[PDB]
Design a binder for this molecule. Structure first.
Ligand SMILES: Nc1ncnc2c1ncn2[C@@H]1O[C@H](CSCC[C@H](N)C(=O)O)[C@@H](O)[C@H]1O
Lengths: 163, 161
């Protein structure tokens, strides 16, 4: 079972998604992609970038946001254990108490998440990774990495090789 | 003087470094780059890449590891409060307790750090990022972000909005 469900809404920049595929494979997360993507999906490019088949073969691809909600049995209005990562959020990523299988939703690199998705979530389900005043948002793949490793830490790193 | 010192040894892959520059500026860390660089350092290329001058203007550039140690007044026999990320490490990055002005050292994505650096550090100063069995290399910017945010969390996110 998926440590976390990492959900990218209309991702734009190929290397970010490539980095996230690698991250999810290393940590036991299930990656979900919501179309339209800003790049064309291509098995051959993913392999050339160094990704192994089993890293990308089992990614879930969703036609649109409501189809993602329906597929994952998330209540469209008040979705269970869905958190949106946004600079517009309230709690820090480390202030949420994660559970296995939580859904973590990230926006596109240029636009961020649409207003109708954020306006429908309560403040406590919109997570802001801390940044200094005046900052440029995070790189998308860095944002995902930070939240994934924080959640995994809280969970006691289930599935990690021990040293 | 710095909240945290992020130190890249022989940074290779130019977009990784760019992403780290932005991470450091967002979190309020002091970035150090130890030569030789694997790419050509050019303010005009950094700007074309989306970085703003204030993000890179105050980076500390060092000619080699010893020059870094000397600039920072660290003892090469056992550098104090320097934590090196390495698959050869013992504690998880989250299993050590960070302090203001700590040094967090990262080698290239693939090669990692040389023995002359790691041999001077005790086991508890060599940190690893946990991974599942049969994992593959994590992107270096993503790794640095993980370590930085864990250390900055432990400090109480000082400076965060
Ligand atoms: N500080 C932060 N906290 C939480 N998520 C962040 C973040 N910085 C970037 N992200 C994630 O990365 C995605 C792409 S960055 C989008 C930036 C957009 N200009 C904006 O107004 O914020 C975001 O949609 C969000 O999911």
């Amino acid at each position: 079972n998926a440590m976390l469900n990492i959900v990218l809404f209309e991702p734009e920049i190929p290397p970010n998604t490539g980095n996230i595929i690698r991250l999810c494979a290393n940590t036991g997360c299930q990656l979900h992609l919501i179309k339209p993507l800003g790049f064309t999906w291509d098995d051959k490019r993913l392999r050339r970038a160094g990704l192994d088949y089993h890293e990308f073969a089992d990614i879930k691809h969703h036609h649109d946001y409501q189809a993602f909600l329906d597929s994952e049995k998330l209540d469209s209005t008040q979705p269970a254990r869905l958190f949106a990562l946004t600079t517009k959020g309230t709690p820090a990523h480390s202030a949420v108490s994660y559970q296995a299988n939580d859904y973590l939703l990230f926006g596109p690199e240029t636009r961020g998440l649409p207003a109708y998705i954020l306006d429908a979530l309560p403040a406590q389900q919109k997570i802001r990774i801390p940044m200094q005043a005046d900052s440029r948002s995070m790189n998308l793949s860095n944002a995902v990495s930070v939240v994934v490793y924080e959640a995994w830490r809280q969970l006691g790193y289930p599935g990690a090789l021990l040293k």
